[PDB]
Amino acid sequence: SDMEGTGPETGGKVFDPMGLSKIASAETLAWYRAAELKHSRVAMAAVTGWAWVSSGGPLFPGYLSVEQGVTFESLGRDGYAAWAAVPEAGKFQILGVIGILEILSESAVKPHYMAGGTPGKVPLLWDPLGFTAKLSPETLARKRLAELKNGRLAMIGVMSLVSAHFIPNSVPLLPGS
């Protein structure tokens, strides 16, 4: 409906050529915004990682798992090839921490986003140092809109990287590997 997210580049109006609303309630629109925000944030983290690792970056100094024979620089510079070179213990640790965090996010917000609440406001994991602890209500909406726009652009970015890795010469700026 009205919500956040809209602004310039569309005319101040909602963008949905295929309908995908008018079959949605407040609960369904809240799910839409929660999924959009989670996908947006994950995609921003994903582009900030793949871009840093593949292009340049000093990489983390150290060893990564003193027992198995792996080095931070031995993982490589490719995105998908280095992910497979991450040990199974590290992969399971990452997935388990993410699962624990999201299960607690589902069970920790008592006005649930599907039962009231605000979509995308997950407990913890945001500013521990309180950078946005003094921002005005008017300025915070601008930052939320900027988050949404940067997240959509990053969604397109991760899918561009995935397309360039899987089917070569797609996304013409991205190289063949």
Nearer to ligand A1EB4, 98 or 159 (CB): 98
Per CB under 6 A, 98 contacts ligand A86: no
Burial class of residue 3, CB neighbours in 10 A (0-12, 13-18, 19+): exposed
98 touches which of ligand A86, ligand A1EB4, other proteins, none (CB within 5 to 8 A by kind)?
none
Joined together, the tokens standing for residue 122 give 């997950």
Per CB under 6 A, 48 contacts ligand A1EB4: no
Q: CA triplet 166, 39, 76: central angle to 5 degrees?
A: 40
| Sites for other proteins among residues 91-120 (CB under 8 A) | 92-93, 104, 107-110
**How far apart are the C-alpha atoms of 142 and 127, rounded to whole Å?**
17
Per CB under 6 A, 146 contacts ligand A86: no
Q: Is the dihedral of CA 113, 118, 120, 124 positive or negative?
A: negative
Per CB under 8 A, 156 contacts other proteins: no
Query: At closest approach, how far in Å is the CB of 94 from ligand A1EB4?
Result: 9
CB atoms within 10 A of CB 123: 11
Per CB under 6 A, 104 contacts ligand A86: yes
Judged by the rule CB under 6 A, the positions of this chain that interact with ligand A1EB4 are: 93, 96-97
Judged by the rule CB under 6 A, the positions of this chain that interact with ligand A86 are: 100, 104
